[PDB]
């Protein structure tokens, strides 16, 4: 029936070694948007989940015209990439693998080409994503502002962060819930003086203000960062107090043995994690962009099956439910179901949203 579930370390982790999927089956009111690279319809874990719903957000020429093949139709929501139809399994998978919600079901609203994304894209996604009803919205992806200060031109990217805030109130008001990638940069957001110094790398800071992992920052977004299979926070992950962690998988040992022994020694066993990609079978992956998803059809469930009409009242029941692995809340779907608690130009220059 699922021929890789042993191959699943990371959502073992998460359901309990599959206790939670014979806890709850979603009916078909329920849905997840997600915003990211597309999706391969066709890919056999993934066609039966697909919803009524889609756009195309990238513009003709893609990324600051460097896509001449993106044609801006707002219908092509064909993956290039491969991370949005992984980030999807991870949400929806019925088959070979198991999703933390297998068959619920996804829409898809593609924000990348094949390479960078802009916040004016992702914010009319996520407006686009509320109001086609999707109740979840997953965002695996995000950029560094700077929102105070100034950088060597005499502005910052307030701007930006106000465009965000706009369509994640909108969100809100619709009744959706956004749930976001913390950042594969290994900061703790909270030390602004470490995110500056990171900054100072890819870009021309004058004076330092404030910086934040956007759209993952506000507050009533749910921001995800990453743990590896002994329930650490991952080596890249960045570390936010008010988080919640989900596997995301480590390059701890990437880094220190190289590629070559990684491979041969098998460590991407249990390093990395394994889902659906756009050749139509699938692939091992790590980042922040993995653990959101898991979140996102956690929260999807607990959605349908207590009837949560307020994501502000979503929220505080996830947080509740979320044991401590080492300080950090963790997600544990049987833990959530069950419900105890009641409630040069580079992939960070400014305005450049990337996958986590």
């Known amino acids: ?12 982790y998460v359901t309990n070694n599959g206790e939670s999927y014979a806890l709850y089956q979603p009916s ?85 080409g094949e390479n960078l994304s802009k916040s004016e894209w992702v914010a009319r996604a996520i407006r686009r994503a509320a109001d086609d009803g999707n109740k979840v919205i997953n965002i695996s992806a995000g950029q560094y502002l700077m929102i105070s200060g100034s950088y060597d031109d005499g ?21 959706s819930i956004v749930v976001a990638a ?26 330092p203000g404030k910086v934040v992992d956007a759209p993952s920052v506000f507050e009533d977004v749910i921001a995800v960062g990453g743990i590896d299979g002994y329930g650490n926070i991952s080596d890249f992950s960045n570390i936010g107090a008010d988080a919640i962690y989900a596997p995301a998988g480590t390059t701890a040992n990437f880094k ?25 079978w699938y692939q091992y992956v790590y980042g922040n962009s993995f653990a959101t998803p898991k979140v996102s059809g956690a929260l999807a469930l ?33 833990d959530l179901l069950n419900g105890k608690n009641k409630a040069a130009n580079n992939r960070n220059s400014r305005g450049a949203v990337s996958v986590r």
């Open 1 to 12: 029936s699922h021929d890789f579930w042993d191959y699943q370390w990371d959502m073992k």
């Open 256 to 280: 220190k043995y190289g590629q070559d022994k990684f491979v041969s020694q098998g460590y991407y066993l249990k390093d990395w994690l394994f889902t659906t990609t756009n050749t139509g």
């Open 182 to 207: 913390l950042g594969n940069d290994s900061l703790n957001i909270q030390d602004n003086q470490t995110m500056i110094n990171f900054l100072k790398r890819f870009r021309s800071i004058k004076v």
């Open 155 to 175: 502005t910052n990217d307030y701007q930006e962060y106000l465009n965000y805030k706009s369509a994640i109130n909108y969100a809100t008001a619709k009744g």
């Open 28 to 112: 078909k009111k329920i849905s997840v948007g997600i915003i990211d690279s597309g999706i391969m319809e066709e890919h056999p874990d993934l066609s039966n989940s697909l919803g009524n719903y889609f756009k195309n957000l990238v513009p003709k020429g893609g990324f600051d015209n460097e896509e001449p093949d993106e044609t801006g139709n707002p219908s092509d929501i064909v993956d290039k990439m491969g991370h949005g139809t992984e980030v999807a399994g991870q949400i929806t998978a019925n088959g070979n693998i198991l999703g933390v919600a297998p068959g619920i079901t996804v829409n898809i609203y593609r924000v990348f």
């Open 302 to 334: 607990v959605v349908d099956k207590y009837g949560i009409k307020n994501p502000n009242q979503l929220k505080r029941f996830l947080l509740m439910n979320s044991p401590e692995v080492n300080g950090n809340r963790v997600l544990n779907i049987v």
